[PDB]
């Protein structure tokens, strides 16, 4: 069958290059047209840019925002397309997708999480979240990067239990509440998988 | 947790051990004495005492005197007593300071409570449960035959509890499998799959399309199951102008 | 110019129902060949999207009978057959005519539909172990409602509101709602919502 399969994956800081590579697989990747369309968190996609085929002329176009220095380029002997991340930005901590076609996006690959961010790791800061008189909740703000998993009475509880997404803070940092809806005193953990730090509460009102 | 528990507990050697010993719960429970308890019921037949010293190695020696299998733990230290428990910072919590208790998954079985329960439990406060009270690993062993487990597979280099778990059903009519493990000096693979071969024997389900996967096996030709026939034929009943 | 689209951005569907979603070109999207130019296109729920439909009407290979496309020039309608729970995602209407394609235009949220629910809303006031750090967050936890249609008001103004909008479930098929109220030290020293699950503000505070 045909795969897109993605990597360049990491981190970076606003200013800095990156590589996005994608490895086509079951038709001849000469005759279609690359592009790169980017996944903004919270929306659908935007379009990056995309080379036209390689006997068309390969010539490239990127959206005006990013035009220059974003660099796409491909090759047929190693079947492999690069999008050179020149210069990344708040706006490039996004998913990333290969689409096989400059205006027939087809496959759409599997997607790349690339992140921008100027924050560093640390474990999250656990605030509760005392109910008014009703549900029991607890914060994991002041985290990143984004692996997550907050379940409740540890795993025991899973009926009620909805853990909010991630939350985007202007200083660079992630954001989530996890909550509970049930009468009654419940314990909530955290782990925070790169630094592992792993923080237990016990919510009273 | 485990490399913290022995670090801190290397010190205690010196003023008790534990011995392990097939005797039957009754005889050794009643001749117990001068700060001796038994830390494990692994069977009707099968108890592991932790004493202090100079008497728990009298009571190997009494089960020597008695002809039972004799083996002076030389990994002797101090646990499901007092010794240990004064300790309640680097005993009790220090080993365990992060957990992930799990949901019901595939029921796992603790001893310290005698009976299953939900993987809530586990973290620092079993080991201080391990480590205070006794064990009652027998009445786990019994809850598994209520909840329907026979076949026993021993995660060790050397055969010690399957060898009890074989006394589980040595009184009870609820016989059941106790794998051997690799005999004591077995240290190669010939040994893992002659043990595999074994528990496969006893029951156990191997899930042999894993085990031929990096050998790059080919399937051929075998005979077929030998159907062993009887004779079944369901003749007419009439005869003719009776 | 640019051909700019429209859809209903927020179509719902059932199970065992047949759906239509539509898309309006302000221009011609029609060629001279008589070949309409739109591209009928999902996104799964955190997954890759896929190419459902191109040329107006066709289907592309893998994708489903489920999916028909047809329309005019300027008007343009998917109806799907068999409403399944893949189906549920964000479709989107891509025009060709014109390619410098800035962004995929605001997607129809496709969502399993139920009865209108009841807005739970749930004022939690900061603990004081949130304040040592000069930081306060009073969270209005907007529970179990549907559609997604809720804006909530921050009174007694507004403005330094986050936004967080959830996983709609399986068993439930509702809404869960976070607007993170991030707060300082002295402007700590009030949450309502207009969901059509209510018609009267419910105005609880902290």
């Known amino acids: 069958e045909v795969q897109l399969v993605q990597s360049g994956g990491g981190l970076v800081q606003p200013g800095r290059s990156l590589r996005l590579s994608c490895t086509a697989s079951?038709?001849?990747?000469?005759?279609?047209?690359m592009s790169w369309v980017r996944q903004a968190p919270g929306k659908g996609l935007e379009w990056v840019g995309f080379?036209?085929?390689?006997?068309?002329?390969?010539?490239?176009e990127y959206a005006a925002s990013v035009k220059g220095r974003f660099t796409i380029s491909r090759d047929d002997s190693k079947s492999i397309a690069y999008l050179q991340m020149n210069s990344l930005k708040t706006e490039d901590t996004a998913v990333y997708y290969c689409?096989?076609?400059?205006?027939?996006?087809?496959?759409w690959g599997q997607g790349t999480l690339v992140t921008v961010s100027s924050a560093s790791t640390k474990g999250p800061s656990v605030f509760p979240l005392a109910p008014s008189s009703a549900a029991l909740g607890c914060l994991v703000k002041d985290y990143f990067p984004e692996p997550v998993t907050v379940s409740w009475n540890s795993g025991a509880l899973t009926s009620g239990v909805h853990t909010f997404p991630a939350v985007l803070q202007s200083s660079g940092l992630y954001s989530l509440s996890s909550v509970v809806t049930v009468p009654s005193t419940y314990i909530c953990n955290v782990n925070h998988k790169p630094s592992n730090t792993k923080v237990d509460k016990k919510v009273e009102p | 947790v485990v490399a913290l528990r022995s670090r801190v507990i290397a010190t205690m050697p010196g003023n008790k051990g534990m011995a392990s010993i097939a005797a039957p719960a009754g005889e050794v429970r009643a001749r117990i004495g001068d700060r001796v308890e038994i830390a494990a019921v692994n069977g009707p037949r099968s108890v592991v005492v932790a004493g202090d010293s100079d008497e728990l190695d009298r009571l190997v020696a009494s089960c020597t005197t008695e002809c039972i299998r004799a083996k002076r733990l030389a990994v002797d230290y101090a646990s499901h007593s007092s010794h240990v428990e004064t300790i309640r910072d680097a005993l009790h919590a220090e080993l365990g300071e992060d957990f992930h208790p799990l949901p019901g998954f595939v029921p796992f079985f603790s001893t310290v409570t005698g009976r299953w329960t939900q993987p809530d439990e586990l973290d620092a406060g079993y080991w201080y449960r391990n480590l205070r009270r006794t064990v009652r690993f027998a009445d786990a062993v019994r809850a598994l035959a209520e909840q329907g487990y026979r076949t026993f597979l021993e995660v060790s280099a050397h055969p010690i509890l399957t060898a009890a778990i074989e006394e589980i059903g040595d009184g009870s009519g609820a016989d059941l499998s106790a794998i051997h493990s690799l005999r004591r000096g077995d240290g190669s693979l010939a040994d893992f799959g002659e043990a595999l071969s074994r528990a496969f024997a006893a029951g156990v389900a191997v899930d042999w399309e894993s085990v031929h996967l990096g050998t790059g096996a080919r399937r051929v030709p075998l005979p077929t199951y030998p159907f062993q026939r009887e004779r079944v034929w369901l003749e007419p009943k009439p005869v003719a102008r009776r | 110019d640019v051909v700019m689209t429209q859809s209903p951005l927020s179509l719902p569907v059932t199970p065992g129902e047949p759906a239509s979603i539509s898309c309006r070109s302000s221009?011609?999207?029609?060629?001279?060949?008589?070949?309409?130019?739109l591209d009928w296109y999902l996104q799964k729920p955190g997954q890759s999207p896929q190419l459902l439909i191109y040329?107006?009407?066709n289907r592309a290979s893998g994708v489903p009978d489920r999916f028909s496309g047809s329309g005019s020039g300027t008007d343009f309608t998917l109806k799907i057959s068999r409403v399944e729970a893949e189906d549920v995602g964000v479709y989107y209407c891509?025009?060709?005519?014109?390619?410098?394609?800035?962004?995929f235009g605001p997607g129809t949220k496709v969502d399993i539909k139920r009865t209108v629910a009841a807005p739970s809303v749930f004022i939690f006031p900061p603990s004081d172990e949130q304040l040592k750090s000069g930081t306060a967050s009073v969270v209005c936890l907007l529970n179990n409602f549907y559609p997604r249609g809720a804006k909530v008001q921050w009174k007694v103004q507004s403005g330094n509101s986050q936004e967080s909008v959830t996983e709609q479930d399986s068993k439930d098929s509702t809404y869960s709602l976070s607007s993170t109220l991030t707060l300082s030290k002295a402007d700590y020293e009030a949450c309502e919502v207009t969901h059509q699950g209510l018609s009267s503000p419910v105005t609880k505070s902290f």
């Open positions: 221009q011609s999207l029609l060629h001279s060949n008589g070949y309409n130019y």
């Open positions: 689409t096989r076609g400059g205006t027939l996006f087809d496959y």
């Open positions: 080379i036209r085929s390689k006997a068309y002329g390969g010539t490239t």
């Open positions: 891509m025009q060709s005519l014109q390619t410098p394609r800035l962004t």
């Open positions: 040329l107006g009407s």
């Open positions: 079951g038709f001849t990747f000469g005759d279609y047209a």
